[PDB]
Paper text:
In contrast to GT1a and GD1a, DSLNT does not contain an [α-2,3]-linked Neu5Acd as a short arm but instead a branching [α-2,6]-linked Neu5Acc. In addition, there is no visible electron density for the GlcNAc O6 that is engaged in the [α-2,6]-branching as well as an increased B-Factor variance within the glycan. The reason for the sideward twist and the missing electron density for Neu5Acc observed in PTA is probably the electrostatic repulsion between the carboxyl groups of Neu5Acc and E91. This hypothesis is confirmed by a PTA E91Q mutant that rescued binding of Neu5Acc. The DSLNT glycan binds similarly to all three strains, with the lowest overall affinity.
Murine Polyomavirus (MuPyV) is a double-stranded DNA virus that can induce tumors in newborn animals. Sialylated oligosaccharide receptors are engaged in a shallow groove on top of VP1 formed by loop structures on the protein surface, similar to other polyomaviruses. The differences among the three strains have been mapped to amino acid variations at two positions, 91 and 296, within the receptor-binding region of VP1.
Author numbering:
A (entry chain D): 34 to 316
B (entry chain E), C (entry chain A), D (entry chain C): 33 to 109, 116 to 316
E (entry chain B): 34 to 109, 116 to 316
The structure:
Amino acid sequence: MEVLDLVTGPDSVTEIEAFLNPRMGQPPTPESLTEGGQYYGWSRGINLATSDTEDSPENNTLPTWSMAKLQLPMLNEDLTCDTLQMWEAVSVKTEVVGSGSLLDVHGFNKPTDTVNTKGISTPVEGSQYHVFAVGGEPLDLQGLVTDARTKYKEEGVVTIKTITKKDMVNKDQVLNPISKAKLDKDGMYPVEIWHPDPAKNENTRYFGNYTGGTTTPPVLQFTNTLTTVLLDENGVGPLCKGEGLYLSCVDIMGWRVTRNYDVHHWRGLPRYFKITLRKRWVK
Amino acid sequence: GMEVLDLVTGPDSVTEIEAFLNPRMGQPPTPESLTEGGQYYGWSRGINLATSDTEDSPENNTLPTWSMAKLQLPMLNTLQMWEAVSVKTEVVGSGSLLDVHGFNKPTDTVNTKGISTPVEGSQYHVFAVGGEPLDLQGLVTDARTKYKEEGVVTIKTITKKDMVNKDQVLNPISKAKLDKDGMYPVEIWHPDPAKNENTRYFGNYTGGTTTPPVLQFTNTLTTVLLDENGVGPLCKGEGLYLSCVDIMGWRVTRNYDVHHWRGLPRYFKITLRKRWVK
Amino acid sequence: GMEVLDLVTGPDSVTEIEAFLNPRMGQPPTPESLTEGGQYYGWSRGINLATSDTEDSPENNTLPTWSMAKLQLPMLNTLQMWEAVSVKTEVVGSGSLLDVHGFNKPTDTVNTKGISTPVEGSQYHVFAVGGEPLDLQGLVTDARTKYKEEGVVTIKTITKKDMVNKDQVLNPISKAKLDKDGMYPVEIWHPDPAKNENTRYFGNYTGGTTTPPVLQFTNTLTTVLLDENGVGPLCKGEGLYLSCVDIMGWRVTRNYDVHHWRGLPRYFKITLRKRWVK
Amino acid sequence: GMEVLDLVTGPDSVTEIEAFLNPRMGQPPTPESLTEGGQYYGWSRGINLATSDTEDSPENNTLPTWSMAKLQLPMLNTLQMWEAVSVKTEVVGSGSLLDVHGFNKPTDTVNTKGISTPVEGSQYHVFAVGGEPLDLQGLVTDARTKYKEEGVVTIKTITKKDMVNKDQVLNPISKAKLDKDGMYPVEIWHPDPAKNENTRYFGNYTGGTTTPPVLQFTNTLTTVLLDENGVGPLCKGEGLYLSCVDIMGWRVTRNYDVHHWRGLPRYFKITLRKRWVK
Amino acid sequence: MEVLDLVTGPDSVTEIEAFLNPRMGQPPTPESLTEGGQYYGWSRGINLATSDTEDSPENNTLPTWSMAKLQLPMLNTLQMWEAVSVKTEVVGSGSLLDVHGFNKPTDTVNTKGISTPVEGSQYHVFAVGGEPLDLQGLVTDARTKYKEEGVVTIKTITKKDMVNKDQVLNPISKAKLDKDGMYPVEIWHPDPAKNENTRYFGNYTGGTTTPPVLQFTNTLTTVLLDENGVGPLCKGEGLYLSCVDIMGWRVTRNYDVHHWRGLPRYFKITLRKRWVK
Ligand SMILES: CC(=O)N[C@@H]1[C@@H](O[C@@H]2O[C@H](CO)[C@H](O)[C@H](O[C@]3(C(=O)O)C[C@H](O)[C@@H](NC(C)=O)[C@H]([C@H](O)[C@H](O)CO)O3)[C@H]2O)[C@H](O)[C@@H](CO)O[C@H]1O
Ligand SMILES: CC(=O)N[C@@H]1[C@@H](O[C@@H]2O[C@H](CO)[C@H](O)[C@H](O[C@]3(C(=O)O)C[C@H](O)[C@@H](NC(C)=O)[C@H]([C@H](O)[C@H](O)CO)O3)[C@H]2O)[C@H](O)[C@@H](CO)O[C@H]1O
Ligand SMILES: CC(=O)N[C@@H]1[C@@H](O[C@@H]2O[C@H](CO)[C@H](O)[C@H](O[C@]3(C(=O)O)C[C@H](O)[C@@H](NC(C)=O)[C@H]([C@H](O)[C@H](O)CO)O3)[C@H]2O)[C@H](O)[C@@H](CO)O[C@H]1O
Ligand SMILES: CC(=O)N[C@H]1[C@H]([C@H](O)[C@H](O)CO)O[C@@](O[C@@H]2[C@@H](O)[C@H](O)O[C@H](CO)[C@@H]2O)(C(=O)O)C[C@@H]1O
Ligand SMILES: CC(=O)N[C@H]1[C@H]([C@H](O)[C@H](O)CO)O[C@@](O[C@@H]2[C@@H](O)[C@H](O)O[C@H](CO)[C@@H]2O)(C(=O)O)C[C@@H]1O
């Protein structure tokens, strides 16, 4: 596809906005705060392997990618025309919202004074993972796991086996080019399995960062003044195939730890996107 | 006026205004008495914990809230509006955290020796300048938290209904405006990125329980408030809104590790210019 | 006086001055004897703790204070004034903190072995250059602190009244000028961002109890002192004021974990030019 | 290709090539079986310790080695040479470290509860792109270390003599070239700054035992390979050499705290252009 | 003194490279790996004060400055060599990934885990100049009893015991870095009041278990030109290189004895001829 001039005139530039809620493990329903809804925004209690050969994590303990497909206004009455128009994503203002909520240290988590069961309710700490992507097609994913022996459920999550129809091999602990997918569904692709594929994603921009550890302080910045440029080295942004715009993210802040056997629950926060798009002539 | 035209020139077309906003960590400014509660001013009262998974009832004086002030600008009225161009802002008093001679939990607890443990832990710094109140989006750790009905503005104050599970993520129904000082808890109310077209805000968060506080201060740094089109916040009816919160962490007492939030005041010096509008 | 005109040119229109400011951590320069107290020079004396929630009286020699110097510039005299354009400044001696062979609390307390624990903890670095004394704003951890009435300048020295609860936040009445070396405690007195129009200051704070100290030093870094209008500090009566504090942390003794503050000296090389004024 | 001339223009004068290099932490790619050792691929085998000050014999499968690949470029032949202009490189799979549901040493060892401790500790990230093998300089912690003679390339492999005490600092005799994947230990062999005129390398090291691993990844970052004269690596005989190591830290088992190194693969996309040379 | 135009023509630019090995305490000889050579690149075991008034560190426990004076091509309106830029790198941080030795183990309860890697206080300084690096003395404790022979200390220069002012800035306590492996880094610091003809760059990170951090690349150039566009000028065609690169300590299994670790530093200096008057 040959990229030409920018389209000018009325309605040649648009802005669209969306929020993507986190997918930490507990689904949005049931809504009742006594039936599981109290865990929404969190995972359920992380369950551990029982031996070196028996690692069966429950689906509601595994954070998954958030995604949304936004439909843009149709540009072309006739797709057989020599020159067409496409929506081009120029820039995005993105923000992770709600870090202030982590200042709640008055709850019933493991307390900081364990002798007297006093102090404060230990705040969310530990491993953090923040990735976002904006593209004109689904985010391309590359599988890679800690342990190819992990017995993921066959129903309820998309894993390497879901794609290949075969058990994971040892190569899946490093880069196995066979283990590929596309982020085409919200709350289904575990982030411990599926990574942005650097060998593809020519029409997507992604930005990720990881900080590990168990008690690591979470850090976050937020402003409405920061614009992320989406143009490539040739001045071209993601081009929206069939007017579809794909937003993908995950924003893990760490864990809270309960007073019962140090059970951990992942915490995620929602992410806002405001994308500026312009019309581009293409051949 | 929504259409922004040329900058106004001539006598008194530019103005500077300055203000300090004191922190609102939980203890109110009065009683002033250093025996009857005033000794906690600049701090929260001792943080009280939930008694079970379903019983979390924090006291109002344990919850840091947003600071805000609405400043009146010179009378003006093709109309003119005041436009905020830039701000010099500074959090004052970090040197006071070098007081390690007090009666906090000591660093050597066996012998009651060492130094008085200085302020440490979770830190939160946000400031905003706009031409209308800061737009707020509610999001909480726990939708079951039983906040007081009087003395604080919470999600239930706005919706007239109990919080729902969606309030633990982004629920577009849970919105407010920062229109009162010392009333909106920072654990509930966040800058709304979907609004605030006429406000600039800047925030950062560092968590943990014993994290060293970090702060820089200088009178040489200017924050530009102009947007991508070169236009700053425009002051509706000549009102300028300043908002902030500056939490440095907690001190911990010698009695059951009781934690008190510490906040510090923020200085603002805002430069404004008159703008023609239609 | 107030109107700033062109730069002066010709013979001796530019000058450079250099000075070092030694730290003022609590022990004075005298007595010099290494067995009568002089061995603590560059350090505070042992930090003394409050005996109750209402009895906190730190000794003056345990409180770090601001360093300052007023330097006389060449005589002058429309009128001319000296203008400070830039400064090269450096904190010297961080390599001395690599002495881990002393008699501090050892890293293996089971066998009393390992190394002598190096200086760690809270760090505070501020410097200023101006044409008049640094303007100070008081703010304390605890308005009940019983600072000594002799040998130190505190809020009560200025107001002639006991501190009030507002002194734990921003109280505009509690102001002073840094006009004496080794007299203004850094846990009380902060650069005032509401004044200091003729001074530039730069500060940073890192808290905690065991935080690793960090420092960079080079002779290749120039700090520009010109304001947004291209005008540096103007030296009133040909006096240049240098102010600083550079706290590296504490060392800890083998006797009940007694802490001593450590400070380091700061070098200043200021470039000045003559300015025509009206 | 000593004298560098103009860039070649016209059809097929620019090319891009991509490759991934898998880590070489110690366990080879085969046997593939997940019950015969294949379950350790991407990791080292369990690190074995010295039995005394004079007996340090690490097993080859416990020692991370350099990854490398030689890529063949399009045939070319005033001659032409391929010139590497820039590279986009990324370390893939940091999200996999969010698996804390396995059978590692648990976070609560008192009750054997909590989560499976994630990978932590020392991290080492180096990559290089050149027109010939990466030049290596030997330097070790301990010249007395008894490395295996077969299966690894060590200083003794090169010199045919035991290591000397100078091998613990810079000994210019101890040099090699990175000409084989999975053979040169990263604890022995470092990029040689005195050579590598036709290679660019970029390395960083973070030590410690429980240090949190940190990684950024994006497809938007380009690394320029051009030198100060605007010339990138020139590919001798149309061969492009890629080299790397990406150690994330260790996992720790529930059996005597046995540590296993973890490595991650690195992606490279190199842009190359034809250059006239004489 | 008066700096004129750059010199043009054949051989008007030159490049010199050198490596400076660390001077952590154990000298290069004896070379034998059973007679002390096994500590080369390290200090010997740090020895502690026995009282508040008795602190006597052994010379081989004290890291000292590395330095080299390099001879430049003969020259002689006169000409001088001018140092324009330097590429510098600390080599061997990968060696700190050896956690298979006999250090204090990470699991001390069972004596298992890994051999604890080098951690703690780190100090990285380098300098390039046309004369010896000017040094300013400043110590933790003016009562420290350094050896009179084998190290250059404040007493070596002044001929008198240290005074309390030596714990802060005492202008009397000055020296020049004119010898390799002799000037303790805990005593001697770059003097910001001198060094008009040298550029130096230093950083310090303290603590006892702090993770060491290091970056290395052959793509980074440090400019040596001052604010007027003039680099260090080499007096008598001598170029001075100075450095120290301390990575932390290793800790043994015997009473937590600490040994400092240093790494070597590479320098590649670009110089040009300058007309001077
Ligand atoms: C209810 C029960 O026992 N269910 C069994 C399953 O165990 C549950 O598995 C999930 C993961 O799928 C979690 O680990 C559960 O732990 C929690 C949870 O619900 O998330 C952790 C919470 O911190 C805890 N809440 C409180 C307030 O203590 C919560 C409660 O204890 C229970 O929800 C109350 O009933 O538990 C864990 O319970 C198990 O996966 C399944 C398969 O064998 O068998 C179920 O019976
Ligand atoms: C005085 C009292 O017991 N009041 C009861 C309430 O308890 C108080 O609740 C507040 C929060 O609203 C704080 O947790 C109080 O703790 C402190 C405080 O006043 O902030 C913590 C201080 O560190 C402590 N100071 C010292 C020097 O010890 C202080 C004192 O102990 C008391 O203030 C002295 O009276 O307490 C806490 O006391 C409780 O919320 C209420 C139940 O509805 O009942 C009140 O009677
Ligand atoms: C000498 C004495 O006991 N004086 C009493 C005062 O106590 C002193 O107060 C100062 C603060 O003003 C310090 O805390 C002193 O602690 C030190 C010191 O001199 O700094 C701490 C040193 O680490 C310690 N040095 C050694 C090597 O042990 C030092 C020595 O113990 C003494 O200096 C030797 O005499 O002490 C502290 O001693 C006190 O303020 C006053 C009121 O009660 O009464 C004084 O008599
Ligand atoms: C699941 C488990 O315990 N895995 C161990 C593994 C097994 O104990 C063993 O392979 C079963 O036969 O042992 C590991 O440690 C190795 C030693 O057993 C071997 O002697 O030497 C190896 C180094 O060459 C290594 O130290 C292993 O196989 O890697 C450690 C592992 O956690
Ligand atoms: C392998 C080992 O234990 N190495 C020790 C070493 C030996 O104990 C000793 O050299 C063999 O006799 O001792 C070291 O400690 C030294 C002291 O023994 C010596 O008295 O003084 C030295 C300082 O000048 C040093 O402290 C050593 O030789 O460095 C420590 C080493 O780990």
